Every structure is written in C-alpha cells, then in structure tokens.
Amino acid sequence: PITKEEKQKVIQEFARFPGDTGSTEVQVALLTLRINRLSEHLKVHKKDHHSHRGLLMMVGQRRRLLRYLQREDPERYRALIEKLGIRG
Template sequence: MLEEEIRGKDREEEDREKLAAVENKEKIIEEYRTHESDTGSPEVQVAILTERINHLTEHLRVHKHDYHSRRGLLKMVGRRRRLLRYLQNQDVERYRALISRLGLRR
C-alpha cells in the first residue's frame, strides 16, 4: 500500500514536470517564431535546443556519472551548431540577432 502511494506521488510529480516542459516549449515557440504558424524555423529549433541543453547541463552538474545523458547533450549541441551554421549561411542578420537574444558565444 505504501509503495503504491509513493509511486502515485512520483507519477504526479513526473506529470507536473512534463506539463511544465510542454508549457515552457510553447512559450519559447511563441517568443522566437517568425510568423503566426511558425514552429520549425531555425530560430525556434535553436531556442528549444538551447533550453534543453541548459536543463541537461544542470542535471549533469548534479549527476556527474550520467554518461548516457552526456551523450545526448553532445548530440543536441552538435544539432544546434549545425542549425546555427545553416542560419548563418542563409541570413547572417537573423543569425546575429538570434545569438545575441540567446546569449550564445559565437
């Protein structure tokens, strides 16, 4: 009985975290989109990846031996780098505006 209550609380907490992540993602899309129905422009993708990278970096500061998550972090950083390179080649002004808004060093 006690284990079921603990698992139930863990699930509720997990559900709240997932809901917060979805709301945060929607807020980022709203902030970085280039037009009304934009959800996949490079700016939006880079902003979402940056948020996920920052979150995972904090996780890895606490859990230093979580190598599986570290690999995922490296893949996300590589994907963000490729998207930024694409944006830089397509429109350097949008690129510069984005990195200044996100506070990235490039």
C-alpha cells in the same frame, strides 16, 4: 522537465510569424532550453554519462543549424545569438 506551456512560451517567443513551429530560430531556441536544462542535470549528476551523450548530440545539432543560418542570413543569425547569448 519541460512542460507544454514552457515549450509553447518559447515557441511563441521565437516564431518568425504566427503559427511558425519549425523555423531555424524556433529549433535553435528549443534546443537551447534542452541543453540548458540538461547541463544543469549533469553538473549535479556528473556520473550519468549516458545522458551526456545526448548532450553532445544536441549541441552538435545546434551548431549545425547555426552554421546554416549564419550562411543564409548573417543578420538573423546575429539576432538569435544576441537573444540567446551563446556561440561566442
């Protein structure tokens, strides 16, 4: 899965400041871990459609957050996709 220290690594890695757990960039990073792990799972378990529905939803929730950032701060919006390597 995804361990507390794995998560915590990624939170720190992205947090806008010390103690930030809920920023738009933290959220988008945490989502991306999940999507990536989940994507790996599904390339091997092609049949597991119930999970693939989870995936569609995460991806949705990602794209929505990104649209938000992109509109509030086209700058850190660009920072986040460089760092993550996605949406384009």
